[PDB]
Amino acid sequence: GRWDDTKGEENIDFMPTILSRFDMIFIVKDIHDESRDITLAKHIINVHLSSNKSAPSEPAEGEISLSTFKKYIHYCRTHCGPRLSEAAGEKLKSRYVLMRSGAGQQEKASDKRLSIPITVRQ
Amino acid sequence: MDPSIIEFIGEKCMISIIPNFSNEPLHLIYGPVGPFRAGFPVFVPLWMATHLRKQQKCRIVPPEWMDMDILEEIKEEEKRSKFFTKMPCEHYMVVAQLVMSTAPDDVPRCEELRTVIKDIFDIRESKLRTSIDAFIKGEGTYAKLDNLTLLEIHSVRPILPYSLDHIARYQRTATASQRDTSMLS
Amino acid sequence: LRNDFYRQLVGKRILIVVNYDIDAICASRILQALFKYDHMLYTVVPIMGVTGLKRAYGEHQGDVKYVVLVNCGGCVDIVELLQPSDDVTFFICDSHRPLDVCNIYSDRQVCILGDASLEENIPAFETIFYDSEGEDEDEDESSDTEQQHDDSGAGESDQEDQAPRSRKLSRLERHEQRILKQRARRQWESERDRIMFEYTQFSYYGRSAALMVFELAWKLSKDNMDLLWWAIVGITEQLLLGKIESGAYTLELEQIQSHVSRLTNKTNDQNTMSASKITFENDLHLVLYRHWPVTESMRYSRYSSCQLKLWTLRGEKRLHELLLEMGLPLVHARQTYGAMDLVLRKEFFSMVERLAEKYDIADIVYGTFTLSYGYRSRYAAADYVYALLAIMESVKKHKTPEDCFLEASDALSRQHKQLLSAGIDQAKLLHAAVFRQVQSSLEARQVHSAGSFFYYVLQEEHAFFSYPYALGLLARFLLRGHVATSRARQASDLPLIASCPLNASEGMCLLVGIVPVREDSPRNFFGKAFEQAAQKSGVALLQDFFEPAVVQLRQSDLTRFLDSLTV
Amino acid sequence: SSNANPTNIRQLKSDCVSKLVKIAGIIVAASGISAKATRMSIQCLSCSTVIPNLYALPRKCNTEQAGRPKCPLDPFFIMPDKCKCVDFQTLKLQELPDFVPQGEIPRHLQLFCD
Numbered sequence: 001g002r003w004d005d006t007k008g009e010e011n012i013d014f015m016p017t018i019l020s021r022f023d024m025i026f027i028v029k030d031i032h033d034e035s036r037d038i039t040l041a042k043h044i045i046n047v048h049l050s051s052n053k054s055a056p057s058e059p060a061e062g063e064i065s066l067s068t069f070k071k072y073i074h075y076c077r078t079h080c081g082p083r084l085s086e087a088a089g090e091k092l093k094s095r096y097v098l099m100r101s102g103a104g105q106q107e108k109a110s111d112k113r114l115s116i117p118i119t120v121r122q
Numbered sequence: 123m124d125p126s127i128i129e130f131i132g133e134k135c136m137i138s139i140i141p142n143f144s145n146e147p148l149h150l151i152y153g154p155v156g157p158f159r160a161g162f163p164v165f166v167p168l169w170m171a172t173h174l175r176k177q178q179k180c181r182i183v184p185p186e187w188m189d190m191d192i193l194e195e196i197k198e199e200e201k202r203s204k205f206f207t208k209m210p211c212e213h214y215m216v217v218a219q220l221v222m223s224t225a226p227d228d229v230p231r232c233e234e235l236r237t238v239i240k241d242i243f244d245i246r247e248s249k250l251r252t253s254i255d256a257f258i259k260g261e262g263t264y265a266k267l268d269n270l271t272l273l274e275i276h277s278v279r280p281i282l283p284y285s286l287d288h289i290a291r292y293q294r295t296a297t298a299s300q301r302d303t304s305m306l307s
Numbered sequence: 308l309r310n311d312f313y314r315q316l317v318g319k320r321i322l323i324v325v326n327y328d329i330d331a332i333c334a335s336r337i338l339q340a341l342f343k344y345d346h347m348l349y350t351v352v353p354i355m356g357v358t359g360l361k362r363a364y365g366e367h368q369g370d371v372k373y374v375v376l377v378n379c380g381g382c383v384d385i386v387e388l389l390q391p392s393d394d395v396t397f398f399i400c401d402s403h404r405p406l407d408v409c410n411i412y413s414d415r416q417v418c419i420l421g422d423a424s425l426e427e428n429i430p431a432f433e434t435i436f437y438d439s440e441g442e443d444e445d446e447d448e449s450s451d452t453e454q455q456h457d458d459s460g461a462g463e464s465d466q467e468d469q470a471p472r473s474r475k476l477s478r479l480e481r482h483e484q485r486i487l488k489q490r491a492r493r494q495w496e497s498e499r500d501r502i503m504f505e506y507t508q509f510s511y512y513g514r515s516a517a518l519m520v521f522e523l524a525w526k527l528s529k530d531n532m533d534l535l536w537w538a539i540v541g542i543t544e545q546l547l548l549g550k551i552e553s554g555a556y557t558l559e560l561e562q563i564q565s566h567v568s569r570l571t572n573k574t575n576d577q578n579t580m581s582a583s584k585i586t587f588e589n590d591l592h593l594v595l596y597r598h599w600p601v602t603e604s605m606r607y608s609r610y611s612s613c614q615l616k617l618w619t620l621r622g623e624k625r626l627h628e629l630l631l632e633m634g635l636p637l638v639h640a641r642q643t644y645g646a647m648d649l650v651l652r653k654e655f656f657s658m659v660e661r662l663a664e665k666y667d668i669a670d671i672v673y674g675t676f677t678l679s680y681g682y683r684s685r686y687a688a689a690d691y692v693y694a695l696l697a698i699m700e701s702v703k704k705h706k707t708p709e710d711c712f713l714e715a716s717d718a719l720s721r722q723h724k725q726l727l728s729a730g731i732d733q734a735k736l737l738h739a740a741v742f743r744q745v746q747s748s749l750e751a752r753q754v755h756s757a758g759s760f761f762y763y764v765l766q767e768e769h770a771f772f773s774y775p776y777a778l779g780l781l782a783r784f785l786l787r788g789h790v791a792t793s794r795a796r797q798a799s800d801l802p803l804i805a806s807c808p809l810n811a812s813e814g815m816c817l818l819v820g821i822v823p824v825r826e827d828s829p830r831n832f833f834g835k836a837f838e839q840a841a842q843k844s845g846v847a848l849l850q851d852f853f854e855p856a857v858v859q860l861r862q863s864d865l866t867r868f869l870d871s872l873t874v
Numbered sequence: 875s876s877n878a879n880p881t882n883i884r885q886l887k888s889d890c891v892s893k894l895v896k897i898a899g900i901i902v903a904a905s906g907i908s909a910k911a912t913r914m915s916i917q918c919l920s921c922s923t924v925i926p927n928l929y930a931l932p933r934k935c936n937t938e939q940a941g942r943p944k945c946p947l948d949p950f951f952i953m954p955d956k957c958k959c960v961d962f963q964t965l966k967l968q969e970l971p972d973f974v975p976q977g978e979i980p981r982h983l984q985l986f987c988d
Contacts, residue, residue, distance in 0.1 A: 641879075643878070
């Protein structure tokens, strides 16, 4: 659980070669706070009460119709084939540079490898 | 080329109808108008029976080509009309629509009638596709109108010609220009 | 009459069609038609309330002389309402009938269509405004006030032996020089016995809003089939003799059929598509025979249900047993009536009418009309109106009230119909959401009697029951609901109230009044009845509607007001 | 087409046969695109062989104009120069996820097209 996540290297049980192939990788913790606790409390109960939100649900802004998203997605992927602009490339390049340098420095700021592999995949 | 521009042409035509007045709060217009007496026919344009019948003022009757047997024989003549057929008033496709809107409150047989007009319209149009299916070698000095009506032709008008210029420019340049052994543009 | 006064109607006007109603739109769209016919431009209006009315006139601060309002009028001596009216022509045509007399009198700026078999209120002005007691419109013995004021020579005039009129009895003193005031109050109060019989005990509705209008436009030679249908809509709203009365049903079977049947413009050639002239048939107020299966629509109406008690199981058992005698299949009881096969869906009503005579229901069948536009399908008598009420869709956009009005009036054309099915759908989902609360509230035992009535209150807002039409509908399904089965035969006859939360409006706890059972002609106390507690303590009450049976309060300023309003 | 009502596979039964219907399921996989046609000729008779159903091929020769030396016993030479061609694909159908899979598994059905 979070024991591995507190201290160091027990992240996966299996391999780093599938730590390789993925871009955005997310911890899930449930760190405590009573405000957070109560707010989770009523938030789901107001959900969990009488099959609650038929009328006052969709009155939120524009967050609507996963149907629309089926159609919207099957459209938007089916047309546009973009690629970069010039000004994006240099800053992203330099950013990945500093990414690998910071990973290597944490390697050196602990005198031992403290990094994820700075891949071309990232 | 429009749905109403041709009614500035077509809707000005006349029939003769019956009103329920005699000469009105005004008598009569200085004009070709006839004297107004109820219970008797009067000749009018057809941009007004529109205005009148729905103003609950009058009855009305059609022309005579608005019938069955004429519109049962014109079609079979028109079948082998390799070129064109009988032309009762030559824009009856606009008169009939502005007729059959309201008047079928009391017109007779306003349905088999419609059937035939559609039956003749479609065929004559479709003929007016296949005329194209022989046009070779730039024949822009040879064509057909001989018993054409107009409500069919405006359905083509902007398409071909704004092309046909640069289309047959390659050959309209031929009887208008010169070059060496090959064809010119 | 206005076969003479209509010939006044050519100049400018304003045509106002007071707060939401089906009488309103049906009565007004015809006149929009009429008035773009004789080449007049005019003004139709949405009304949000009497204040909406007053600002509306305020925004129309011209001298439009031919002012017109319809289905309203009993609010004030409306010259007091509408001061700048000088000789301006107003027209009242309201069926909210218990109307003031100062609006009737003052034959200046009003239309007394006074025509009724009740000659009961003739001196109703001859003593309240015409007499008075302890008054200042008078002279004094001093020489500084030596001018004759508006000497009615009555109690309206002095009471110090100065009354040239009032020549029924003695002059100086009957028993005293001011027994004038004594007899003044004698007649005043002994006939406020009848004034308070008016307007302070009960209210009702009268006649049509727009069948008179049909006869008006009938005298100008118009056989507009659609106008028959629109007026039919206007009546079939409160044809509901349990809601508000028709009465004339078995007399309009002569009246309207005589309007329409005798003049047969085509007796032999009518088998055509478009608008084949209207018909008449005897059918139900079963909700929606047509586009739904039986078994859901046999379940959401009150009268079919309450007599056979289906929100508990056992009603379904006897239900199935009568489908048994009917021999409907259950699948067929769950396919749309039209979606059924033929012979069953022809013979359905043919059998049901006669062998429901014998099993607890007698009062489902009616007399009404229906017709085609074309070949799509055969629309129904009321399935417009139950699609209409579902268009009062109080969304938070702030435009949707007036916009839904404008939409509704743009609905009953033969054109706009993609929305009409929308109205049907919206109606159905609400219609079984009605039922969805009754089981919850009955068997939770929320029927608060609290003394002389039954009483309901609710807790939060539903988009159904934001507005009060749905609220009266709630109250008018539960009531039968509870009072069928929880009572002896003694206490089935008491009235009902119901709270109505408005989480929208900062907390106001809306209410609607409604009446006890099975007294069609004996109608509301609540023309004023609520106002008692308004006098006794009196807290932020409203009576904004020309509809009487309604108020609007604070969230929480009701209960003690109710404890006062016990009696 | 219609909007009548969808049924369920659990009821597609001997009564519901040779009869038009409406359902709603879900799809799994279905075949390739083979073949089918409607009629064709045969050299033995030289007539486009007309059928009601979409096979019996009787005895007599029809190359009988050989004198008395006829060709009996079904000599049929199918002439697909003279045949036709329509499609055929065998669609498929699984049942719903809520309509008696509960204490059971879901069945399914195979289909057809032209």
